[PDB]
Design an enzyme around this catalytic site. Sequence first.
Site, PDB file in Angstrom:
ATOM      1  N   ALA A 117     -34.690 -88.600 115.373  1.00 51.70           N
ATOM      2  CA  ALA A 117     -34.822 -88.852 116.812  1.00 51.70           C
ATOM      3  C   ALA A 117     -34.150 -90.162 117.214  1.00 51.70           C
ATOM      4  O   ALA A 117     -34.757 -91.037 117.835  1.00 51.70           O
ATOM      5  CB  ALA A 117     -36.285 -88.808 117.265  1.00 51.70           C
ATOM      6  N   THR A 118     -32.871 -90.284 116.848  1.00 54.61           N
ATOM      7  CA  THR A 118     -32.075 -91.446 117.230  1.00 54.61           C
ATOM      8  C   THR A 118     -31.785 -91.445 118.727  1.00 54.61           C
ATOM      9  O   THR A 118     -31.826 -92.500 119.378  1.00 54.61           O
ATOM     10  CB  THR A 118     -30.766 -91.455 116.436  1.00 54.61           C
ATOM     11  OG1 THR A 118     -31.053 -91.371 115.036  1.00 54.61           O
ATOM     12  CG2 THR A 118     -29.968 -92.725 116.701  1.00 54.61           C
TER      13      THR A 118
ATOM     14  N   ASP B  31     -35.198 -73.435 113.600  1.00 55.66           N
ATOM     15  CA  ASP B  31     -33.757 -73.479 113.350  1.00 55.66           C
ATOM     16  C   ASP B  31     -32.972 -73.283 114.646  1.00 55.66           C
ATOM     17  O   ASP B  31     -33.426 -72.611 115.575  1.00 55.66           O
ATOM     18  CB  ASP B  31     -33.353 -72.391 112.347  1.00 55.66           C
ATOM     19  CG  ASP B  31     -31.920 -72.547 111.836  1.00 55.66           C
ATOM     20  OD1 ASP B  31     -31.291 -73.601 112.083  1.00 55.66           O
ATOM     21  OD2 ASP B  31     -31.401 -71.584 111.234  1.00 55.66           O
TER      22      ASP B  31
ATOM     23  N   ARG C 106     -30.342 -71.585 114.952  1.00 55.14           N
ATOM     24  CA  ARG C 106     -29.938 -70.189 115.007  1.00 55.14           C
ATOM     25  C   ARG C 106     -31.010 -69.275 115.588  1.00 55.14           C
ATOM     26  O   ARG C 106     -30.723 -68.100 115.842  1.00 55.14           O
ATOM     27  CB  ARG C 106     -29.545 -69.729 113.606  1.00 55.14           C
ATOM     28  CG  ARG C 106     -28.325 -70.462 113.087  1.00 55.14           C
ATOM     29  CD  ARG C 106     -27.953 -70.035 111.695  1.00 55.14           C
ATOM     30  NE  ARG C 106     -28.942 -70.475 110.724  1.00 55.14           N
ATOM     31  CZ  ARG C 106     -28.914 -70.145 109.441  1.00 55.14           C
ATOM     32  NH1 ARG C 106     -27.943 -69.371 108.976  1.00 55.14           N
ATOM     33  NH2 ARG C 106     -29.854 -70.589 108.621  1.00 55.14           N
TER      34      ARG C 106
ATOM     35  N   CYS D  44     -22.638 -83.930 107.963  1.00 54.47           N
ATOM     36  CA  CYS D  44     -21.503 -84.550 107.290  1.00 54.47           C
ATOM     37  C   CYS D  44     -21.796 -84.811 105.815  1.00 54.47           C
ATOM     38  O   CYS D  44     -21.133 -85.649 105.194  1.00 54.47           O
ATOM     39  CB  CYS D  44     -21.104 -85.853 107.988  1.00 54.47           C
ATOM     40  SG  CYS D  44     -22.322 -87.187 107.859  1.00 54.47           S
TER      41      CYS D  44
ATOM     42  N   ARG E 152     -27.635 -90.341 107.064  1.00 54.39           N
ATOM     43  CA  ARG E 152     -27.055 -89.324 107.930  1.00 54.39           C
ATOM     44  C   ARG E 152     -27.046 -89.733 109.391  1.00 54.39           C
ATOM     45  O   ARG E 152     -26.328 -89.120 110.187  1.00 54.39           O
ATOM     46  CB  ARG E 152     -27.846 -88.031 107.830  1.00 54.39           C
ATOM     47  CG  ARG E 152     -27.786 -87.301 106.521  1.00 54.39           C
ATOM     48  CD  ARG E 152     -28.452 -85.981 106.762  1.00 54.39           C
ATOM     49  NE  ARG E 152     -29.837 -86.183 107.183  1.00 54.39           N
ATOM     50  CZ  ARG E 152     -30.893 -85.994 106.404  1.00 54.39           C
ATOM     51  NH1 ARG E 152     -30.725 -85.526 105.184  1.00 54.39           N
ATOM     52  NH2 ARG E 152     -32.116 -86.219 106.862  1.00 54.39           N
TER      53      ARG E 152
HETATM   54  N1  LIG Z   1     -29.904 -75.568 110.928  1.00 53.00           N
HETATM   55  C1  LIG Z   1     -30.290 -76.808 111.216  1.00 53.00           C
HETATM   56  N2  LIG Z   1     -31.020 -77.019 112.337  1.00 53.00           N
HETATM   57  C2  LIG Z   1     -31.406 -78.269 112.621  1.00 53.00           C
HETATM   58  N3  LIG Z   1     -31.177 -79.395 111.950  1.00 53.00           N
HETATM   59  C3  LIG Z   1     -30.453 -79.157 110.846  1.00 53.00           C
HETATM   60  C4  LIG Z   1     -29.984 -77.929 110.420  1.00 53.00           C
HETATM   61  N4  LIG Z   1     -29.273 -78.065 109.237  1.00 53.00           N
HETATM   62  C5  LIG Z   1     -29.324 -79.347 108.974  1.00 53.00           C
HETATM   63  N5  LIG Z   1     -30.023 -80.067 109.909  1.00 53.00           N
HETATM   64  C6  LIG Z   1     -30.259 -81.506 109.902  1.00 53.00           C
HETATM   65  O1  LIG Z   1     -29.394 -82.106 110.838  1.00 53.00           O
HETATM   66  C7  LIG Z   1     -28.972 -83.403 110.355  1.00 53.00           C
HETATM   67  C8  LIG Z   1     -27.463 -83.443 110.287  1.00 53.00           C
HETATM   68  S1  LIG Z   1     -26.768 -85.007 110.875  1.00 53.00           S
HETATM   69  C9  LIG Z   1     -28.223 -85.834 111.566  1.00 53.00           C
HETATM   70  C10 LIG Z   1     -27.883 -87.079 112.363  1.00 53.00           C
HETATM   71  C11 LIG Z   1     -28.867 -87.359 113.504  1.00 53.00           C
HETATM   72  N6  LIG Z   1     -28.142 -87.655 114.770  1.00 53.00           N
HETATM   73  C12 LIG Z   1     -29.748 -88.557 113.133  1.00 53.00           C
HETATM   74  O2  LIG Z   1     -29.482 -89.649 113.674  1.00 53.00           O
HETATM   75  O3  LIG Z   1     -30.668 -88.355 112.317  1.00 53.00           O
HETATM   76  C13 LIG Z   1     -29.681 -83.610 109.017  1.00 53.00           C
HETATM   77  O4  LIG Z   1     -30.885 -84.347 109.187  1.00 53.00           O
HETATM   78  C14 LIG Z   1     -29.958 -82.174 108.566  1.00 53.00           C
HETATM   79  O5  LIG Z   1     -31.052 -82.082 107.679  1.00 53.00           O
END
Ligand SMILES: Nc1ncnc2c1ncn2[C@@H]1O[C@H](CSCC[C@H](N)C(=O)O)[C@@H](O)[C@H]1O
Lengths: 428, 428
Positions: free
Chosen positions: B171-172, B213, B215, B237, B407
Amino acid sequence: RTRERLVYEVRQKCRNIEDICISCGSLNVTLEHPLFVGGMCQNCKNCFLECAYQYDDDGYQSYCTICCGGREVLMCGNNNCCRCFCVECVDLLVGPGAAQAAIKEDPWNCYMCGHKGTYGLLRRREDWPSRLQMFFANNHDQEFDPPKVYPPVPAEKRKPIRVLSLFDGIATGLLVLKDLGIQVDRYIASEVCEDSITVGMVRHQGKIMYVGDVRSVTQKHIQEWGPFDLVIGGSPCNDLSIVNPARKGLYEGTGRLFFEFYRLLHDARPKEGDDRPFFWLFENVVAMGVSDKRDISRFLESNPVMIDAKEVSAAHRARYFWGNLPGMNRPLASTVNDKLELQECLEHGRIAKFSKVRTIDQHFPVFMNEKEDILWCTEMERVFGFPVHYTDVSNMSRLARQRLLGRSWSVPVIRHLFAPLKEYFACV
Amino acid sequence: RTRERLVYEVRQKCRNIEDICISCGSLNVTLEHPLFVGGMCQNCKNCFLECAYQYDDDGYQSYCTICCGGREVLMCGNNNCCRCFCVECVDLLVGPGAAQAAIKEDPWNCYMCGHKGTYGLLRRREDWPSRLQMFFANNHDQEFDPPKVYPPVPAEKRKPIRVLSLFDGIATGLLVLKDLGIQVDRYIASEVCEDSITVGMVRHQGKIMYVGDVRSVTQKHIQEWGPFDLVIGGSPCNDLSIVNPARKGLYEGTGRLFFEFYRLLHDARPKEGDDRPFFWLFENVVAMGVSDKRDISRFLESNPVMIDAKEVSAAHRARYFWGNLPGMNRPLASTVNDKLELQECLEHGRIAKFSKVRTIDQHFPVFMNEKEDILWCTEMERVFGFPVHYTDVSNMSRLARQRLLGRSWSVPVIRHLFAPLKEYFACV
Ligand SMILES: Nc1ncnc2c1ncn2[C@@H]1O[C@H](CSCC[C@H](N)C(=O)O)[C@@H](O)[C@H]1O
Ligand SMILES: Nc1ncnc2c1ncn2[C@@H]1O[C@H](CSCC[C@H](N)C(=O)O)[C@@H](O)[C@H]1O
Ligand SMILES: [Zn+2]
Ligand SMILES: [Zn+2]
Ligand SMILES: [Zn+2]
Ligand SMILES: [Zn+2]
Ligand SMILES: [Zn+2]
Ligand SMILES: [Zn+2]
């Protein structure tokens, strides 16, 4: 040995490191060591005054930084750092097995340049440049009265300044007075070396009245050449520094010539009851004797002010100034015209590895066309803040002309000192 | 080989070095090389986009800096420098006998860090950080129309913002909106990893409505969860970077999840004729494919803006931002609260060897008590500008929690981006 036993008793938490003199192990702890942790005895203070700014021909320090003595020193591989740590101090403060292993380390930094700065028995004081500046205000051993402050003369009543310059050289003092825009009534200047006479004659257009040796100037000469408003001078530092390999004496020759400045100062001083504004400046180098510095302080009846030119110019030109010029203590300000980097003082097509050159193995400071080269004479003029092509007067060799430049005062430092004299004398 | 013959013809002064592509020797010279002297063909531009910010596990670059390829690279010994020069380029630009002799030189600097900075066949172009910044405005291959600028709503008519965040993480985005003082009506957030859910739940006090999710989110869900005023997101990434040793694919997994952001963006976009202020931000890393970057640019119908966090924080966090937020191009300003040095982000009793750490044998960046140590988790939070002890919510391991921190977006960068939204929505 005894001091090594003392440090052993410290590391077993039976004694504090701040209660012992880390340099020589004396129990007579009066001061704290300015750079590192530990006390400091007064004899070590005198040895620290003499030895700390003494550099070999190498460019690096003459002695160890910790104790100012030692036997075999370890030179620092970091760029622009010139410090040396002797093996005996590193046996204590880092440990008896770490000096040997630190020699084997080929990129070896010293403990003032260590990327950490916090070691086991040796930690670096929080503010060491501040304590280095305060360490010369700590020289209250020679306690004196402050220099007499004269009230400023009104601007309509100001007159052109009259300077008796002894040990003129290349006429740095008159050049700085003209840079400030002060009207100069006359500039008497004693000087012996023909080349420095000639530089002054051409750069100051016959305005300077030249005298022979300082030892030929009588009190009658001082009375008949008009009242003087500013007497300036600086003792020779060719023999007085540790840079000259031929140190047969210390105050043979140069010491005499100091007393010549002393005598003609008294000859030029107005009487008591004559409240006219009179000023005087003496200059000397910092790599000097303590009892030497005492005798000078006692004769001139004042406390010296150390001024390093690094604060305003591209050189490391740390010099003692005695005098009564107002604001001799106040901190140095570097204008935008002054070049604090060495690279700005280089010619075009030349790039410097150093950021500051010091002139009293990378002896030659400039990497041009994959080749090591010394600073050209016009660049050395730029380093001290002389005008461009200042010494190109007569058909003189390069070695002589570099030697003629290196003795000279640092021009923005002397501008900083002479600047409040505008408040007392007429302007152009 | 051919390019070596070409450079041979250049050193005879029969060809300019600026008329040839110094990377691969191509005659199709469209661009100039940004760092050094020479042309640049477009294929080498694509290879430069992909490879320039790719770093090994070592910390140093994955490939050569000159040609982005090479065979055996030479790593730089200078502190904080991570560049590599392959042997084949140094055979040309410095000479065929100087690479071998420069290996033997144990304190070896590279030619972006060379004190002289001027070599025989290789010289360094002067305004190279300016040309590195202009090189991403040079990506006009993907030409588009500028993002539509909506006129500002008056301050009395402003309402709390409604954010659809996809790939929320810790939650940035909501934290940065609260840092700016913007009233948040609701914050929907899709996220799968439990730890990042939990961090958000505790640090934002149950205000976040959490979804499964991405999706599983239909257009019906987008319509029924209220109109959204700000849709944000960032693709994973972990696989997309070259830092993960397990690069089985490139846009398997992560690529899918981008299109999930693309779809729900269209589902949240107001219709044409509905002129209400709507905004969106996508984020991705810079060590990515060109055709990848093209496809993303074409789908989101915009030009990316590279933003490096070095300008505002203590990390090198260079990220592409697509969006229509006003002032996404304007230069970054680092406030006094932001810590530009690494040392300020350290705990007490720790001193840093580096001034910047980037983490996507000096693998551990901290010299504490004669010992090499990782950045503690609370310091990594300080490096990105998170509040102190931000991720200490649940009983999670250190490896997982560091992985959870790495991340995340850089907090002053996201503050810089989100800041003009105050002009469009209500304040606390
Ligand atoms: N299908 C999905 N649905 C939601 N989040 C997902 C996902 N697959 C991966 N993620 C999550 O999304 C993130 C990718 S990058 C996260 C960066 C985020 N802006 C921050 O500041 O934390 C990771 O935490 C990963 O675990
Ligand atoms: N007896 C003497 N009388 C006058 N000048 C002397 C002298 N003995 C030496 N000198 C000269 O005095 C200088 C010592 S130091 C000169 C520094 C001077 N302020 C400058 O900026 O040039 C040298 O030039 C030296 O040659
Ligand atoms: Zn002592
Ligand atoms: Zn010593
Ligand atoms: Zn050092
Ligand atoms: Zn090419
Ligand atoms: Zn290469
Ligand atoms: Zn380098």
